[PDB]
Design an enzyme around this catalytic site. Structure first.
Site, PDB file in Angstrom:
ATOM      1  N   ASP A  17     -18.707   8.708 -26.334  1.00 12.00           N
ATOM      2  CA  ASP A  17     -19.937   9.394 -25.955  1.00 12.00           C
ATOM      3  C   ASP A  17     -21.055   9.016 -26.926  1.00 12.00           C
ATOM      4  O   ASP A  17     -20.901   8.146 -27.789  1.00 12.00           O
ATOM      5  CB  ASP A  17     -19.705  10.901 -25.906  1.00 12.00           C
ATOM      6  CG  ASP A  17     -18.609  11.291 -24.936  1.00 12.00           C
ATOM      7  OD1 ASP A  17     -18.420  10.572 -23.931  1.00 12.00           O
ATOM      8  OD2 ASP A  17     -17.936  12.314 -25.177  1.00 12.00           O
TER       9      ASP A  17
ATOM     10  N   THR B 266     -28.090  13.790 -22.881  1.00  8.36           N
ATOM     11  CA  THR B 266     -28.375  13.525 -24.285  1.00  8.36           C
ATOM     12  C   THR B 266     -28.595  12.048 -24.573  1.00  8.36           C
ATOM     13  O   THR B 266     -29.613  11.677 -25.166  1.00  8.36           O
ATOM     14  CB  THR B 266     -27.234  14.059 -25.165  1.00  8.36           C
ATOM     15  OG1 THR B 266     -27.087  15.468 -24.957  1.00  8.36           O
ATOM     16  CG2 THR B 266     -27.526  13.795 -26.634  1.00  8.36           C
ATOM     17  N   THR B 267     -27.660  11.187 -24.164  1.00  2.00           N
ATOM     18  CA  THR B 267     -27.808   9.758 -24.420  1.00  2.00           C
ATOM     19  C   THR B 267     -28.919   9.154 -23.569  1.00  2.00           C
ATOM     20  O   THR B 267     -29.705   8.331 -24.056  1.00  2.00           O
ATOM     21  CB  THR B 267     -26.483   9.039 -24.161  1.00  2.00           C
ATOM     22  OG1 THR B 267     -25.458   9.611 -24.984  1.00  2.00           O
ATOM     23  CG2 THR B 267     -26.607   7.556 -24.476  1.00  2.00           C
TER      24      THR B 267
ATOM     25  N   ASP C 187     -17.877  19.426 -20.909  1.00  2.00           N
ATOM     26  CA  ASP C 187     -18.907  18.722 -20.158  1.00  2.00           C
ATOM     27  C   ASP C 187     -18.664  18.745 -18.656  1.00  2.00           C
ATOM     28  O   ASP C 187     -19.472  18.187 -17.906  1.00  2.00           O
ATOM     29  CB  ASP C 187     -19.014  17.272 -20.640  1.00  2.00           C
ATOM     30  CG  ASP C 187     -19.412  17.172 -22.100  1.00  2.00           C
ATOM     31  OD1 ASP C 187     -20.100  18.088 -22.596  1.00  2.00           O
ATOM     32  OD2 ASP C 187     -19.036  16.174 -22.753  1.00  2.00           O
TER      33      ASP C 187
END
Ligand SMILES: Nc1ncnc2c1ncn2[C@@H]1O[C@H](COP(=O)(O)OP(=O)(O)OP(=O)(O)O)[C@@H](O)[C@H]1O
Ligand SMILES: Nc1ncnc2c1ncn2[C@@H]1O[C@H](COP(=O)(O)OP(=O)(O)OP(=O)(O)O)[C@@H](O)[C@H]1O
Lengths: 507, 507
Positions: B45, B78-79, B371
């Protein structure tokens, strides 16, 4: 020697003078400050920049010391004063090439400062105390570089209604105590105006009521518990049945102690220290508000608002040392729990609470409220509101050019330089834009060449030229006069140095 | 000075922005992280990458701090937010060569963000609470980069059946307590969904039964043994035959103490500390479950599920402080021994157990369950499910180009740059393949030029182009809106810095 140590002092000042140059307009860039431990902070104003700055050079200290004395006056004309001082120094540095030596320039600046102060007092109007629509534009335009994306309408209708309480009645002395609390929440931007007393302290035992009608506040200090200080006269013991009896008597004394306060007429208990859990039930069977841990900053606001005295002991409480309140409540808002006391007696001061999202937003408002009320107290007491937005400097520049023609000598070049240096404000206020460059300064210069046309200036929210009094920019005159005085006083503490020596003796 | 410290801040951010660029697609490469002691770990991740990273530079800290505040919201965007921010920074770096200075670009981004947020709310549909076949595709597509070689069908039918319990009844508040235990085993990939209470603690004396029907759970804390605290009032001894008698009486008191609990209606004993071996036989002649060492995290789940209170002493137990259970068993599964309590009363939360082979596989599921439920709670409360797989950015890019034509000025180049920067998602999702290169982006661009055709996107499990709603990719809209907001907020905290200074004062 005379020209070697003189240019270095100006070069050391021009570096620190142009640092806060970009932090002047409403839409300017911020400054990132790092430390040795690793504290990265962001500062948009210029007051904090002058403090946290390497003052290792002697030239980069006197200007900051002078600016700190002026910032404590009204707190508005700090960065612009440094910008004007740097512009004056840069303009005077070039004039030293003709070999005239610094002397006539100081006299020219002193002669031009008086003329500027006399001309500023003739371009203002008269603002009485019966107005209301005029007193809100100054508060609206006071919050621009802080955060206009949420403070432009909501924060412009609660400051005027809070300040206009004791200023309109007494237009001379209006020293109040405004406290801003730094607390977060969950909403976007919420502003609360508490018309009473706010206490920032929670509890641990939720076994006391929080809704008492027409309660009375009683201020009690220490000397209440059994052991809190010391005793010089020691005691002895004889029989085991005597110490227990004395302990039981001292424990039961609290019952009559609370009964006396109840009969005197009090329902709110504010103690400096903490209240024991065993003393709560005695306050629950009679309907008395129980509180503990009262800060001195929050306790000093109770004698001038509710009207009560303090008791240094416990047996010195009668009936005249009591106050009066309205409604005491303990609500859990924005995470933490605070105590709200509404309806006092003399609403002198006021409390403002700001609720944001993270932790750096509320602090951003903390440096905005103090700079928003300071421009109000100097408005009712004075009333010489001029046209803000960089219009006074351009107006005085067109007058100084024709005023300097009546004198003959080398002092005319100093007045002309001082007049040309005043055009740095519109160049810095228009540098933040892209469609301004230099045409704006040329257009706003020939516009005031007629008879009238004075309120026109420059606005960064349009692009063209128009009047400033009709938009909502009404910067006062004191913040300009003090800034000009500081710039004229700081520019003379460097040219009168010439040489510099050193010594090994302290002071 | 203005252009020297500005490019360095962008170059320091572009290095850390492109680090998690490869860790975005479902079949991307992992990251090997080493330490000074010699700890080699593998992270797929991008959330863990931002944490364990050299934050020695001031520019590589604010972006991570902003991303950490957004990851705690839904934990999905997020990424991609960091990728979009890096793309925006790289696109804006080239625009600074025309000598425009950062100001109009911020206004253009702020104007384009509102338009994008308004357009995203018009390309979704309405998903009610009566559906079931739609709520499983989001859970199936939530586990892709974690491990699709064993989690693609078995892990997609137990999450929907576990979450849909209190969310369909109350579509507003559904805050539960989901705990994932990290334990190994011997099977390939086993998933157990316990519909009760799970205790992770063994014993040492296997002399107690583990099969009691309709047993009752009784929560007892400390203050049970003979010595566990302290006593201020000391005692004395007179005759040797008195201490032994007192010890015998205190030992026999446990018999009636257990008899009282048995008569009150309880068969399960949960103590905080340990139970002595001598107190086991007294629990065996009456059919009472004996247990010891109960963690607070496992004990707090007994008051809201079974329905029982706690006892601070031993003599404060009556009849209303008891609960109800179904079947308490102690089986040895996956090596260790755990306690399973089935059939409670109020099935609020649920327990999920994952059994793998080694030790790094189960942990791989530990970062996959949290998640996978986070995208479900935001589905019933909202319902604005859009077409995932990189189709919203391409749809908004075709609209921003025609929307930016209605304005005139230098702000159009900022909107065009923001629209062109949105095409980085399909380029990163197709870079992991070999037969994609750049033709896929050209083919998916001219396909949406007609009237309809909106659900079409890109899938890495085929190669051609087709609809995304028919396969099983239904990414929600909140994870995109929050990511866009974070990218728009992070790109403005760097261009508004320009210069950077330092100081020796703390804070
Ligand atoms: N809409 C506007 N049009 C024209 N000028 C403006 C406008 N808004 C603000 N200004 C100018 O910006 C100045 C205030 O800038 P800002 O509040 O960002 O810092 P500052 O208060 O000058 O800092 P310091 O108090 O340290 O001097 C005012 O002098 C005012 O003339
Ligand atoms: N079959 C698929 N077709 C198209 N896109 C997919 C497919 N599977 C996953 N994706 C995309 O992959 C993204 C998720 O990638 P992954 O789970 O590997 O990391 P991530 O969750 O984005 O990381 P972070 O939570 O830190 O942003 C989703 O945004 C989704 O659009």
């Amino acid at each position: 020697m005379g020209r070697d140590a003189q240019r270095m002092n100006i070069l050391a000042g021009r570096i620190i003078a142009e640092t806060v140059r970009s932090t002047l307009g409403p839409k300017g860039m911020d400054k990132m400050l790092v430390d040795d431990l690793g504290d990265v902070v962001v500062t948009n104003d210029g007051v904090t920049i002058l403090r946290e700055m390497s003052v290792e050079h002697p030239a980069a200290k006197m200007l900051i010391e002078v600016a700190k004395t002026q910032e404590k006056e009204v707190g508005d004309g700090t960065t612009t004063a440094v910008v004007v001082a740097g512009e004056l120094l840069r303009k005077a540095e070039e004039l030293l090439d003709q070999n005239v030596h610094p002397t006539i320039v100081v006299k020219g600046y002193q002669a031009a400062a008086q003329k500027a102060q006399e001309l500023l007092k003739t371009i203002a109007c008269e603002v009485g105390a019966q107005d209301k629509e005029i007193l809100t534009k100054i508060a609206m335009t006071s919050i621009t570089g802080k955060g206009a994306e949420k403070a432009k309408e909501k924060l412009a209708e609660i400051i005027v209604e809070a300040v206009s309480a004791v200023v309109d009645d007494e237009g001379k002395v209006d020293k109040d105590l405004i406290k801003i609390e730094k607390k977060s929440g969950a909403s976007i931007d919420d502003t609360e105006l508490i018309k009473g007393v706010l206490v920032d302290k929670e509890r641990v035992s939720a076994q006391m009521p929080k809704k008492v009608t027409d309660a009375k506040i009683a201020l009690l200090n220490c000397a209440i518990e059994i052991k809190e200080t010391e005793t010089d006269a020691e005691i002895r013991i004889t029989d085991p049945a005597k110490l227990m009896e004395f302990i039981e008597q001292e424990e039961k004394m609290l019952k009559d102690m609370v009964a006396e306060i109840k009969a005197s007429g009090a329902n709110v208990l504010f103690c400096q220290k903490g209240i024991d859990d065993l003393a709560q039930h005695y306050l629950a069977k009679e309907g008395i508000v129980a509180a503990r841990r009262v800060k001195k900053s929050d306790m000093e606001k109770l004698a001038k608002a509710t009207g009560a005295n303090v008791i240094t002991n416990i047996k010195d409480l009668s009936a005249q040392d009591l106050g009066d309140a309205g409604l005491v409540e303990e609500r859990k808002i924005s995470g933490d729990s605070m105590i709200f006391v509404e309806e006092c007696k003399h609403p002198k001061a006021v409390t403002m609470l700001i609720r944001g999202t993270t932790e750096h937003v509320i602090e951003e408002v903390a440096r905005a409220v103090d700079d928003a009320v300071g421009v109000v107290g100097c408005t009712i007491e004075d009333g010489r509101i001029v046209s803000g937005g960089g219009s006074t400097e351009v107006e005085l520049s067109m007058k100084l050019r024709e005023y300097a023609e009546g004198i003959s000598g080398r002092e005319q070049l100093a007045v002309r330089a001082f007049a040309d240096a005043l055009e740095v404000i519109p160049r810095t206020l228009a540098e933040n834009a892209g469609l301004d460059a230099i045409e704006i300064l040329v257009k706003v210069r020939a516009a005031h060449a007629s008879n009238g046309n004075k309120c026109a200036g420059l606005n960064v929210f349009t692009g063209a030229v128009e009047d400033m009094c009709e938009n909502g920019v009404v910067e006062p005159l004191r913040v300009k006069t003090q800034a000009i005085q500081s710039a004229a006083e700081s520019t003379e503490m460097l040219l009168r140095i010439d040489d510099v020596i050193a010594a090994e003796k302290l002071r």
